[PDB]
């Protein structure tokens, strides 16, 4: 097993067994609350439901809970493994459910291998569950089970295989047809394979506007022809086309859309020559796609390529369809899931792809929205609800949409989507630039944490790393760590680069009158930190990430000495604390020992600019130990800093001084100090000295369940970032992601000048 | 209906459910998605293919029970349907999680028929690691229990019958063993041997009783031979030899009276006719069967242990199912065995028989209070012993020390710290003749203070001496509609009989510090100064203030009047109660910029409090550098750590560190293995006021941990100052700990 395999194995091993747990929604520790929960004060909701049964949806979590039910017979690529071993997949499905829609998930791995036991056992769980997701059931049992369940149950039932990927496939097909200006009246599709996904795709395409005679079904044995005596399954013979294309090679003559859903290797360049004008190719059977996009473009440049892998664009992911469907169904309190909801979802996905703080560009490489696009939910969950306003079988029938919009936004706070949006923005910036990752120089080439994070960063295509150090030693360390992904990395020895002496001359010219001459300049450039700073300054790299193996002072001194600050800029750290519904920005945590009022105001302005880059209105607060006291010492300095920042940036909302609770709690400020101009809480917090900010952010990172990312060195001319020496692998990954974002922004700003 | 509306908020409150499901493992990134979803999620699956039992090592099956039901008998109500019973099942689940740390699902089976219910629960076997099916109808409960025990391996447990049996046996064994009678030969009569009483009688006969040695008289008369009224196939398991039918003749009141059903049937004439030492268990209906006062008045020589929460000797299921099911789960036990039931009842009896002290085992402490922390820590290991002895646990058994460590970790400070503080307050009050500490509140006309005082006086913690106008505060109390405050003591500072003596003593204290008789008379009108003088002169045990005014103006009179003891420095002490440990931040209120000696003294004081709370203190002098010793704060922190080490050479106090290095053992061991601090630091000493204040306030607000404080340490007497931005529950916690400190200081002053 590789390093990733071992990490995945230990993912469910370390700490508490499993991944999911059940906790009280609100705190319950007091004896009065315990009596409210144990003494017969909890019988009152039962009596309330007694007079109104359906009202239970508002009297419990049933309306916000989804079953995830499987028998362990179609677990990914494992085939039949039994319900016992199908538990971690259900846990992962529930994790994805909560991540992408915010719905509580109950994973039930029922041991009903027989169809009758499944049907007569699932039906009895109806009154206590708000919706069921069937999955991981092998054919042909799954089709019959779902068909019986849909009629025999009065609450929505969804199958991730019978109505799963086919929604994203239909959205991609709609976008491809719009690109090719071809209507659904005369379209040719050959759905290779005879699995659940193939039949689901065929059914939804037929219900979408395709003609059943035009479409054909192909499998391992061959194309189902008229009067076929092989494959006596009812579902297989249902999608039987009267033709003579049993041969695989000749079955694709004049094929408008490949939509291939068979194992890898079923497509060849000679086979690719058999497609019709402007064909569309779909991958299948991860992790090996049906055909590589590069060879498809080389052989047939007029074609359109869609894949099921993260590496190549146009990723068909099953996570785009189910979470929004279920969120819309439950919030609208729908009593069933019909084809109208799925068609509405397909239309919404196609519309979103056709048309944080930015988006992609419509084209041949963007037919469906990326799975990391949060707006997906906001653009398809209401639409399903819209279908619930027309199709029917839905109670409640919410009359508002903005309230629904903000309710949906409440379930996608920064703690869930901030890093995902940052990585998506990095990908958008790289792809819009031609497809080159920013060059990030790592002075610590022989650092275990840096290399272990570089494996993930290279796999995720975030940055192009340039490790500094002796090539032999870093290669030995990579081989010892067993990372078969950094073997092709670029390693640059400091005193071997062709531009090394140019860097020495540049540093000598910069600081000739600051205590450095040629003899000292060469020795300084021998250091990896100074060489990395010079590389970043001179344009040989976009950014740099150092300080993992040394203290912050001697890791940030070369950056300030070489790269320096820009006009009217002060170097300053900056941390993002990603809470449930907001992210706070603490500044500064790393550089300034005891900033004055002017320095505090400048730090506040820099932090506000960084916040505004992310599309969030900044509200600065000058933290202190006193609430608008203005007394001698820190309160006076914070008051003066707030006034200076207000004069510099009048349109903002700055106020000081105040304590942390007054700043970050709008209710406290409104109740106690209604005169202050800061309304709604503060997302930017400027600290009086270094000890306060450093200790506060480290304590929040350690003992607080919230996640902090940083510190990021702001106020420097180029994109230089220093990691805290106590960082972890994930901290390095996040910091490198945001360093790549900053480097791309700085490079784009430089170019557009 | 706000009590129901509280759960309706729990059902809306930006959260539409009483319970919710979160992810213990992180899920925020594409790598995390690959780890949790396909194709990475296939990697553990192939691991489980070799051995199915490895699910207990991979998935959350081990810590997963369910409250299965059908709504046939839900709480104090008859048949209601599976749909309408969900809130009570969710309450059972949250009780499970709170008192045992067990994740629990809420499944309702919409089937009154036995066959479908049994089929569904049997087929849910690999889904769940344990079954706590509860609130099903009877006597079909016996049938479903037997069928499920015979069908699948995982332990099926009916909470009602067996938990009632365990609690009844625990209350009965100690009572019988102290009444000069035996539970095996002396003819006990009891009341009931059916449904839950059937399990009660089975537990009794397993604990010494029998069918022939013990004559059983039922709640529904008697289930002996003859009369066939209200008979079923599962009732004659305890036929007796008494041949009478009427309660007067069938029941002669021989040894005990354990009623579990039917309305109140206990007459004073019958209690007089009872032979000797009436042991009465009158849980029965949701409503009390017979009130304990009437039964006690009927027989003065009677020892009555009712089964209601309104009276002492409480009987509850929280001493039953949680600990025993935790024990069964931890060993991956197969099915449910009687031996574990007798082990649990013996553990409860021993715990009942054997902070500062505990309530005397007499007529009031037959069983401990049904929320005590030691209950689980005692019952669960014994249930594990029984499960191992019965040979039903497939999983191997390790040393019991690690098991006890895990059981203790199941209930960290965040769940039990305030409750244990309240219990210690009550124990100190009981050990002091029932007197409560007198706490004087300078702000007698503060809405938050009065609202918190309602709960504080309802919980019997402190005695308010609210200062201010005797009429204005009464008007405020009437406006806020708090009845319990109608009997509190209101003192006008300028009209108290001891006002002039206090003025004279204040003038004597600070005659050479800018205060003369006129200025002392002017200052004693201040409620803060008067409360401080009251505490200093012993007329009140403690005081809390600052809920409306800023900290400086609220703490200056305390420092000027009460002062600091020898070798003491005033400091603010905050407790951050995390899931596994509690940190102590100091100082957060007073010292603008303490020096090395001041920081060392603050650390010593904080270590003293931590030692008082029964935890080994580990001190860390926080800074922005990691053992750098550079000019400025790092050098001051290093010097302070050295001074504190020389002062108390038995604690582990380590240099200057960042917060992450201090509170994380892994970072400390990996980066700085040359240090003397091991296992993390539970005491943090900050270099200045801004750092500590901002850190504690930010942790309180944006963190998910509970911060209680700040507490004023280093003063001669008990006197705390609340934060201006405090809430009602914060005031409640601060007053609880102020009362605890006042009791400790009064006890210290009583001697010498
Ligand atoms: C995540 C963590 O680990 S946080 C740890 C806490 N932080 C620390 O321990 C480090 C705190 N900072 C410091 O100790 C220092 O201020 C350092 C390391 C930034 C600089 O060391 P110093 O001896 O003060 O300065 P140094 O000689 O390196 O100065 C380098 C350059 O920075 C510039 N500089 C430093 N601070 C500032 C500032 N606030 N504004 C503008 N320029 C500045 C100087 O002008 C100088 O430029 P020059 O070469 O043209 O003269
Ligand atoms: C994306 C995130 O997460 S952070 C988002 C932050 N949002 C913002 O709006 C950031 C605000 N702006 C900034 O931080 C910066 O000032 C930026 C991004 C505008 C970049 O400013 P820069 O382009 O680096 O300024 P710079 O001073 O280098 O450019 C002016 C010229 O002076 C030159 N120059 C100035 N000082 C020096 C020096 N010491 N040595 C050499 N050249 C110098 C530069 O080479 C440049 O010349 P060029 O354009 O021919 O190459
Ligand atoms: C929870 C929150 O909101 S925390 C808010 C942040 N904290 C604050 O704003 C308050 C910080 N503390 C202070 O400002 C001051 O130190 C105060 C208010 C406590 C008192 O300091 P001063 O106002 O200078 O005191 P003052 O001159 O009135 O004397 C008061 C007494 O306190 C004593 N005292 C004050 N600080 C100390 C100390 N660190 N050690 C010993 N004694 C002390 C003085 O000796 C004096 O006693 P004395 O009259 O017998 O000589
Ligand atoms: C419980 C928690 O959570 S925190 C745990 C840790 N807490 C602590 O350590 C708090 C410490 N608080 C205390 O009171 C200390 O334990 C003590 C008892 C040692 C302090 O002693 P003090 O309160 O200073 O009193 P002291 O020992 O001086 O009293 C002896 C005599 O001096 C007299 N006295 C002392 N100071 C004065 C004064 N200013 N004016 C008049 N008489 C005085 C007392 O009247 C007493 O006389 P008596 O024998 O006739 O009764
Ligand atoms: N969007 C996605 O990335 C996505 C979504 C869902 C599922 N999946 C993948 O789908 C798989 C599970 O579902 P499935 O229905 O695809 O399983 P599957 O039915 O086993 O997939 C292959 C089947 O297609 C037929 N087939 C056609 N041409 C074939 C050929 N040349 N070689 C072999 N078989 C050929 C065979 O069926 P006959 O023997 O009956 O002819 C074969 O059993 C997993 O790999 C899962 O990851 C991917
Ligand atoms: N130890 C505990 O914490 C504990 C235990 C149990 C109950 N309670 C409390 O008691 C309430 C629940 O009541 P419950 O009925 O489930 O438990 P219960 O009153 O202790 O059980 C008595 C059972 O006997 C039967 N019975 C026979 N005659 C009866 C009569 N006249 N009235 C009532 N029942 C009669 C009923 O079963 P049939 O309907 O099958 O005859 C009933 O379920 C809740 O408030 C709950 O909190 C607490």
Numbering used by the authors:
A (entry chain F): 11 to 365, 376 to 773
B (entry chain E): 12 to 365, 376 to 773
Give passages from the manuscript:
While reducing NAD(P)+ to NAD(P)H, MEs catalyze the oxidative decarboxylation of the TCA cycle intermediate L-malate to produce the TCA carbon source pyruvate and a byproduct carbon dioxide (CO2) in the presence of divalent metal ions such as a magnesium (Mg2+) ion. The hybrid-type MEs consist of an N-terminal catalytic domain (ME domain) and a C-terminal activity regulating domain. The PTA domain does not possess an enzymatic activity of PTA but acts as an allosteric modulator of catalysis; that is, binding of some metabolites to the PTA domain increases or decreases the enzymatic activity. Binding of acetyl-CoA to the PTA domain is known to reduce the catalytic activity of several hybrid-type MEs.
